[PDB]
Design a protein around this ligand. Structure first.
Ligand SMILES: C=C(C)CCOP(=O)(O)OP(=O)(O)O
Ligand SMILES: CC(C)=CCSP(=O)(O)OP(=O)(O)O
Ligand SMILES: [Mg+2]
Ligand SMILES: [Mg+2]
Ligand SMILES: [Mg+2]
Ligand SMILES: [Mg+2]
Lengths: 259, 295, 259, 279
């Protein structure tokens, strides 16, 4: 990836390590710490800091939210790769590595999601006026994007993808749900915490939606290549359009993320 | 004169009616069917009542507490759904019906559990009316701390990871019960106390009270696990028997266990003296019920 | 009550028969007329005329909408009962008889649906200034309720029901989509065409939504009996409660089918 | 005109874009997947072009007519999905790809088709901006009339009912063609023309142009099959079929004599393309 994005990503990693310190009970915090970083990095998170900067604010205003987004995603990744006895989830080729047993992964997943809201409720600075109304709004975006009508519908419908007999349209929908909504949430939260106006939030939201969707297709391309650049050009186009109206030292970086 | 059976019957009807409205069937259908199947199957609603009674106690009303009350019950529910899974306690009966995974598959049970967890935060955050924004945020943080790696989840993980522990110190058995069970009840009493406008001292007193009944609740759970049948409880009873699990009926036997619950109740009710006895009657009642319930 | 609802089904029927004249080519209109009338009537239309009068309008102001709702309903009925080659749609134990072949039934339903919209556009009275907006709005309401989001969705999910093996939650949902959406639509349009304010329309829409789910849930009781009466009352409760603010006979006569 | 192909191609493009945005994948997924499967399969988008061109012809802009353009392609598409069905023409392929019911089942093909039909009314009704309400209702009136029992569906019934009595005369063959093909083109040009704010006189000329090219297409099509059941050649011979085609084309063009020459050019250019197609 590009220097700017990798640098933003590294600040989230630093912020996460400084926030999750292994302590007793280690049997609890070791898995919590390991599993947070074992989940893949997600742009819905760096996008939150980036969106913030673009509209005004300073990246520190969106850190807590960016960490929360990563954590909600981290929890979902852990659960979707969970060893399930009954063959309920189409035994996915993935076969990722597992340092801990199913029970500890299940539970750690369950402890990571609340940690996200904790940092958010506790990132409330006495010296910030509109702090609580925006944090609150962001908690709502996050819990919705990680809920039953968001990322969860995406994971659920993804179990119905039969390798090379499922259409591109369906796959794009699963990526929209599974990655698009979280990205849309990240750019919007950043936009919110930065201080933009409704019109910009929706623009950045719409941008996140398309970009996360395109990103999911990329990670799905390595799977079954039917992916024409017709699908990708489509989403790339849809993304940049939403960005029309932002110009400057980042509003070309935000553009680079898709270009 | 306090009619507890009457008070709870209506509080629970009121809580059940709001749980059904907050989680409706909608696409994706199976995920939602799975959320309602376990959430509206039929718990006693101790946590949501505790939340509502603490809010009313410090001056507020049920309507301001109802969403958080529902939220603590959402998180309570998913925690049982995940506890029942084959990789966990692997049970087949919960609230009198087949466990969620047995009826929808393990995949949906995990996902719907996760759905309930996230949605409890969405719901408290978006639906609470009658509370300043900083107050809601604050309550969301209390909720988060009480169900995470310093609360519910920490208790639960030390639980499965200490199931071989035969050298189980009481300090270890208290860590488990305080966390896997008392942490969620405290949060329930705290969300209500804060949402009702309670002053820090009242919050602190109810937190202490809540820690008491919270521990009492698990001691009592362990004694029913051992003196009642699965039909009775509504869930698979007696596995804690076999395993090397750290229940109280282990380290002191049902008897020295009962006396203990007795001291806890008293101790909790002693914290209620901070409040006018007429106003505390409901929480006093919820406390004896926690001690005396049959299931 | 008793004879009011009948004079209503009869007025809607005389308007339809007056609107669909068998004529050349009979190969086309024979089937069109037959199928419109062989379709069980739907309370969604009744409900439309009643809500229009309930709010003060004249029954005629809602006749076109009421007939359009029957036509949309009739088309779906014809189509949900098509003998199909592939075993797509489960075999209906109560099989309707067919006086026409599959091709003609399918095409006819395609001609019936637009005839309802034709009747609506054609009912605009140029000497009535509020006519276009109310009728426009009504066409949006009916096209949405008979569309992929409404009735079509119930028709489609209906096929997933296993007779002795399907929860009541799933079923009530299929009924809210298959019948509820349309009934809600009927009462809402009746109120719109009648001159009612937004407050009255929503209340009426809500009532219809609960009424149809409820009435469709009986159509079902015939089939799969798990026919709890705990859902019947949970719904009429929510229904009869929407009437609150409205009192009298019709303002409590609507509370006559919820019996 | 210059570059007629480039012009049809810009139109198909902005229309495809708008179709994609109008019908997104969503729950229930199989219904929506089936709707896009056939709607977005790419084709010449002639109907949308007619609507848009007619709107522009009388001063309107593409933007106002777009929902209506998408609508007529919607109708067109579901008429094809229904027609491929086992009980209809029973086609397993269309343009080299599995037909809609073969991909998703007959039930979804039927239901998705129905969804495209009512959505056409909804999208026109709810997405049209820049038009007064009465104009939009009139336009919905013309769509219904052009695809119902006196338009497309009539032409489709009478045809399935005449695949049996091979003694069809010129009048009967024209009935089917006018209803099965011209009615919906007539619908396209009329919505565009009305949404564009054209006079009643203007609307009538455009209605004529469509009926002429609608029939022009089937006639020409019969001529080509021959120089490569009832057909124009079996009924009146190729010579007269050709005379007829030329008359249809000339009449179509006569309708356009009074509009601006430059706005009329795409329509005149489409009539000639229809008349001279080699294939
Ligand atoms: C002992 C614990 C921590 C959980 C089971 O609690 P409950 O006894 O409250 O069960 P339900 O009534 O909700 O079904
Ligand atoms: C404390 C939490 C989160 C779950 C249940 S603890 P447990 O398994 O000891 O008791 P039960 O399953 O309720 O019988
Ligand atoms: Mg357990
Ligand atoms: Mg258990
Ligand atoms: Mg045909
Ligand atoms: Mg065909």
């Amino acid at each position: 990836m590009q220097p700017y994005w990798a640098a933003i990503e590294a600040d989230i990693e630093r912020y996460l390590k400084k926030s999750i310190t292994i302590r007793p009970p280690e049997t609890v915090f070791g898995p919590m710490h390991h599993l947070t970083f074992a989940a893949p990095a997600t742009a819905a998170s760096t996008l939150c800091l980036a969106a913030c900067e673009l509209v005004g604010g300073d990246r520190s205003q969106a850190m807590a939210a960016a960490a929360a987004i990563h954590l909600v995603h981290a929890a979902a990744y852990v659960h979707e790769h969970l060893p399930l006895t009954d063959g309920s989830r189409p035994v996915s080729k993935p076969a990722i590595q597992h340092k801990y047993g199913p029970n500890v992964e299940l539970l750690t997943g369950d402890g990571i999601v609340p940690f996200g809201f904790e940092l958010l409720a506790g990132s409330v600075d006495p010296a910030r006026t509109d702090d609580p109304d925006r944090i609150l709004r962001v908690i709502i975006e996050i819990s919705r994007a990680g809920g039953p009508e968001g990322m969860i519908s995406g994971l659920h419908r993804e179990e119905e993808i039969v390798d090379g007999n499922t259409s591109l349209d369906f796959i794009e929908y699963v990526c929209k749900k599974k990655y698009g909504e979280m990205h849309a949430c990240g750019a919007a939260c950043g936009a919110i915490l930065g201080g933009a106006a409704e019109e910009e939030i929706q623009k950045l939201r719409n941008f996140g939606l398309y970009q996360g969707t395109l990103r999911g297709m990329m990670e799905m391309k390595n799977s079954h290549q039917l992916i024409d650049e017709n699908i990708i050009g489509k989403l790339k186009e849809l993304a940049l359009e939403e960005l029309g109206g932002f110009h400057g030292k980042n509003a070309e970086l935000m553009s680079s993320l898709v270009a | 004169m306090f009619d507890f059976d009457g008070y709870m019957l209506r509080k629970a009807k009121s809580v059940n009616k709001a749980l059904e409205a907050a989680v409706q069937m909608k696409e994706p259908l199976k995920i939602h069917e799975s959320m309602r199947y376990s959430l509206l199957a039929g718990g006693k609603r101790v946590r949501p009542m505790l939340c509502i009674a603490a809010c009313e106690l410090v001056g507020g009303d049920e309507s301001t507490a109802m969403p958080a009350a529902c939220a603590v019950e959402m998180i309570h529910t998913m925690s049982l759904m995940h506890d029942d899974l084959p990789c966990m306690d692997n049970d087949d009966l919960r609230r009198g019906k087949p466990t969620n995974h047995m009826a929808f598959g393990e995949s949906v049970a995990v996902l719907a559990g996760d759905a309930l967890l996230s949605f409890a935060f969405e719901h408290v955050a978006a639906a609470t009316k009658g509370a300043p924004p900083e107050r809601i945020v604050r309550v969301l943080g209390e909720l988060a701390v009480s169900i995470g790696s310093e609360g519910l989840v920490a208790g639960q993980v030390v639980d499965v990871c200490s199931e071989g522990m035969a050298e189980v110190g009481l300090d270890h058995l208290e860590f488990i019960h305080h966390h896997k069970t008392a942490a969620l009840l405290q949060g329930s009493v705290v969300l209500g106390a804060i949402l009702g406008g309670g002053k820090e001292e009242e919050v602190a007193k109810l937190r202490k009270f809540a820690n008491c009944i919270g521990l009492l609740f698990q001691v009592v759970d362990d004694i029913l696990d051992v003196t009642k049948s699965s039909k009775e409880l509504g869930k698979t009873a007696g596995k804690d028997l076999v395993a090397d699990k750290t229940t109280y009926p282990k380290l002191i036997g049902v008897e020295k266990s009962k006396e203990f619950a007795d001291r806890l109740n008293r101790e909790a009710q002693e914290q209620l003296l901070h409040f006018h006895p007429h106003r505390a009657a409901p929480l006093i009642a919820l406390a004896n019920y926690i001690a005396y319930r049959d299931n």
